[PDB]
């Protein structure tokens, strides 16, 4: 098989081989071992043949696979591997290296394959084998298709072992005006065909013979034989009766129009709608043509016509001739005034490129299936509550939604993530940016799925992890800025309701923890909400969407969430002792995202994002907002008091037990609040100073960050050596972002003594190791676990501290090396 790479120069024979092997694979009287051998050969070939050379095999597969019968098992795997390997050749505008780039026909075939498989699987009954074999195929094809690919031959009606049956021309009759038209067209057809014969250098001779180049019908249509007239007029009679059966009412609207000459027809051009009409007419001609080939197949008694693949499947090359024939017929109709009936199909197909993008249709289908999800989840809830029903009238709907859409959604929006986040101004993806409608649709999908899952994790059961993962992916792919700034009120209200419901659920969880529905809510919030909400807040913070998303009602909901999570601090229950980490991470992300200095209410007058500024005093009372920003909730201390308390604890040298809340929630909140508001407070890059920049809404300076980092180091030193300190790893990660603004005196103040203590401990444990090695037998075996545990705790402390040290070094290496520093030298020694 490998030798088939780079065989362009015999593509015809390679394609013939592939078709022969496929036909052998789908064969009767073939034992299972033989069939396995054939399938292995086909897959091995396709693994190495260039993607451009499998176009015809794809054209056959697009017709075969959708059936999803038993034979469809192998083709599904073949397509899965092909697309997973050649995804670049189809997706990337530049294409795969040295293999070229896809073409419109191949993209069209891929899209038809995807949608055919999708529809067949949706309508088919559940089957584990088929679902497991098909889901990867759908994922691969979706990942291969460009998100914004627009099908040139797009259709809305999408009417309909190939059985080409043309409309019954004989049934309908032929009008007499159109009979006159047909006579004129027959004269025309004789004239053009004789002009082509002239191009072939034909002559008018009483006998018919190509070698003599004599042809007795090179005589004027007046003298053209009546039988010959009849046979040159019959094709159009049949075609026009086909059109009448199609209801393409054609009428004499405008004026109507030897030496062979071609009457000019290419002069008149069919506008897009009449071009589609001619495409349908050419499809009908192809139907008659393939019916004749069928008749030949019955004459043979068994076989297959190579070009029996439908018109849409055919590439433009084979289409071109029949398209030209239909085009000529309609062109003569136009020059004879006769015009086909376009009805409303044309402008109900027109839509637009945005509605024709692949991503658009995919998201539309996903939203429709989400609507179906609402219905059967309601039914499942009703039956589970009471009245045991094992019928599950939507059973296959549940199985589809849980086994196909969820993995699909996950993989698709993991791959095409930048496309949905790119904007015309700023394109993050390789190429292309999602339209506003697509962004709104993905936002609505996220909101609807979250609402579906709310308080219903058990119902999904084993699929709940999958639903949560899908929610994470959508949250990371959501373009909240654009959706909020310009989007339908429905979508905006959906997102606002998501945030409001999240705040309510967090409040209920907090009160329950402070001490049926209780267990349901606790499980829901601790499994789906908190992770998903944390991911959403992290996404907003990373993309700086906070100044655009978290406003007005969303801002109020974020106040409620923040204030409840922090207010939970006073509690000391064992359940809290387990939930503190997740709550702290969520609070850190929320602090990184929120656009108001909630720890500096005094300077809130200058915040243009605060609700107290965006809304009017007349408003903000129609809601429950208090008169003063300070009164939103006073449980959280102001920045100065909070910093003073943290410093006091660090200096007093308390242990993790005495301040679980500070180490788990408060400190992670500050490690995100301070870096964010430093950029927007004084002592910041002043690009806005040229203008009359309003007073900064905050007072964060490098001093705050330096003090916080010193306090964190002091706290870690205080808790240094403890047997169980699982919180250090989280604290170090949370404190990493704030190191960049550390001040040079920090080295000697904190880092040198800390690493000195750590070196001393390492030396002591090494000495114990040496003493054990000096001893032997039980003396060596005993205490060996002791030294191992001592090294374990030492490694924990090292991995808690060095991650901070490295960042401090990376930012001060330049200064240390430029100007010698004895403190830096001592740190090197340690």
């Amino acid at each position: 098989a490998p030798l088939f790479a780079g065989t362009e120069h015999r593509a015809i024979m390679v394609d013939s081989m592939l078709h022969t092997v496929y036909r052998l694979s789908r064969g009767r009287s073939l034992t299972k071992a033989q069939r396995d051998v054939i399938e292995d050969c086909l897959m091995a070939l396709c693994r190495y043949i260039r993607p451009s050379m499998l176009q015809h095999l794809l054209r056959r597969l697009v017709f075969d696979v959708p059936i999803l019968n038993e034979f469809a098992k192998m083709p599904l795997k073949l397509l899965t591997n092909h697309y997973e390997r050649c995804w670049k050749y189809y997706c990337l505008p530049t294409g795969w290296a040295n293999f070229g780039v896809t073409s419109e026909e191949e993209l069209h075939l891929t899209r038809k394959l995807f949608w055919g498989i999708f529809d067949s699987l949706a309508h088919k009954k559940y089957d584990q084998e088929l679902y497991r074999i098909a889901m990867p195929c759908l994922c691969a094809i979706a990942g291969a298709l460009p998100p914004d690919y627009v099908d040139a031959s797009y259709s809305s009606k999408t009417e309909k072992n190939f059985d080409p049956r043309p409309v019954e021309t004989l049934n309908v009759i032929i009008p007499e005006k159109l009979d006159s038209f047909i006579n004129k067209f027959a004269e025309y057809t004789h004239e053009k065909w004789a002009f082509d014969k002239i191009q072939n250098n034909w002559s008018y001779g009483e006998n018919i013979d190509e070698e003599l180049k004599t042809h007795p019908m090179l005589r004027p249509y007046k003298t053209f034989s009546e039988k010959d007239k009849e046979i040159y007029r019959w094709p159009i009679k049949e075609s026009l009766k086909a059109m009448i059966a199609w209801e393409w009412t054609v009428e004499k609207a405008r004026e109507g129009e030897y030496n062979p000459q071609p009457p000019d027809l290419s002069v008149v051009t069919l506008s897009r709608e009449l071009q589609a009409m001619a495409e349908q007419l050419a499809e009908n001609y192809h139907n008659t043509w393939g019916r004749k080939k069928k008749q030949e197949l019955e004459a043979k008694g068994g076989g297959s016509h190579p070009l029996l693949v439908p018109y849409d499947t055919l590439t433009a090359k084979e289409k071109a001739r029949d398209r030209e024939k239909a085009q000529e017929l309609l062109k003569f109709l136009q020059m004879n005034g006769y015009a086909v009936t376009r009805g409303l199909k044309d402008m109900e197909l027109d839509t637009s490129s945005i509605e024709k993008r692949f991503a658009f249709g995919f998201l539309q289908q996903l939203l429709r299936w989400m609507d179906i999800s609402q219905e059967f989840i309601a039914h499942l809830e009703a039956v589970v509550s009471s009245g045991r029903v094992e019928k599950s009238p939507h059973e296959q709907e549940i199985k589809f939604f849980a086994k196909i859409l969820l993995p699909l959604i996950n993989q698709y929006f993991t791959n095409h993530c930048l496309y949905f986040l790119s904007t015309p101004a700023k394109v993050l993806g390789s190429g292309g940016h999602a339209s506003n409608k697509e962004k709104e649709m993905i936002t609505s999908l996220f909101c609807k799925l979250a609402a579906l899952v709310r308080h219903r994790v058990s119902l999904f059961g084993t699929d709940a992890p999958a639903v949560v993962n899908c929610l994470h992916i959508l949250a990371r792919s959501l373009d909240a800025r654009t959706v909020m700034k310009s989007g339908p009120e429905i979508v905006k209200a959906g997102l606002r309701s998501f945030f409001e419901s999240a705040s309510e659920d967090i409040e209920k969880m907090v009160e329950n923890l402070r001490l049926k529905g209780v267990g349901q809510n606790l499980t829901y919030t601790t499994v789906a909400l908190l992770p998903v909400l944390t991911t959403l807040f992290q996404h907003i913070a990373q993309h700086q969407f906070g100044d655009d998303v978290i406003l007005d009602d969303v801002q109020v909901s974020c106040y409620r969430t923040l204030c409840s999570i922090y207010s939970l601090g006073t509690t000391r229950n064992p359940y809290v002792e387990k939930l503190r980490p997740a709550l702290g991470e969520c609070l850190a992300r929320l602090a990184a995202a929120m656009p108001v200095a909630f720890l500096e209410p005094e300077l809130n007058e200058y915040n243009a994002c605060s609700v107290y500024t965006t809304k009017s005093p007349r408003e903000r009372a129609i809601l429950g907002l208090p008169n003063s920003v300070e009164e939103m909730c006073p449980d959280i201390p102001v920045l100065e008091r909070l910093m003073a308390e943290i410093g006091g604890l660090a200096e007093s040298g308390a242990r993790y037990t005495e301040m679980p809340h500070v180490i788990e929630i408060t400190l992670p909140m500050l490690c995100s609040y301070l870096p964010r508001w430093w950029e927007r407070g004084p002592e910041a890059p002043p690009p806005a100073l040229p203008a009359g920049a309003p007073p900064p809404c905050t007072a964060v300076t490098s001093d705050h960050l330096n003090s916080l980092l010193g306090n964190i180091l002091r706290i870690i030193v205080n808790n240094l050596g403890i047997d169980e300190a699982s919180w250090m790893k989280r604290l170090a990660v949370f404190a990493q972002p704030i190191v960049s603004r550390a001040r040079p005196e920090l080295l000697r103040s904190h880092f040198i003594p800390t690493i000195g203590r750590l070196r001393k401990r390492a030396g002591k444990v090494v000495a114990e190791e040496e003493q054990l090695r000096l001893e032997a037998k039980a003396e060596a075996e005993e205490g060996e676990l002791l030294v191992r545990d001592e090294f374990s705790v030492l490694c924990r402390d090292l991995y808690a501290l060095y991650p901070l040290l490295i960042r401090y070094v990376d930012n001060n290496r330049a200064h240390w090396l430029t100007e010698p520093n004895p403190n830096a030298e001592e740190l090197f020694r340690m």
Binding site: R813, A814, L817, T818
Partner: protein, 48 residues
């Protein structure tokens, strides 16, 4: 050199022209079309 000391000096990298009496000569891609013999291995054109 503005950052040689910061990164490369201690790693043991030497400036490209450290011990050359004279500045290094350079060549540039001049965009003035010129006639040259058809390469004997040209991927597209063959002369017999």
């Amino acid at each position: 050199l503005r950052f040689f000391a910061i990164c490369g000096l201690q790693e043991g990298f030497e400036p490209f022209a450290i011990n050359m009496q004279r500045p290094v000569t350079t060549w540039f891609s001049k965009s003035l079309p010129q006639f040259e013999p058809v390469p004997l291995e040209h991927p597209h054109y063959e002369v017999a």
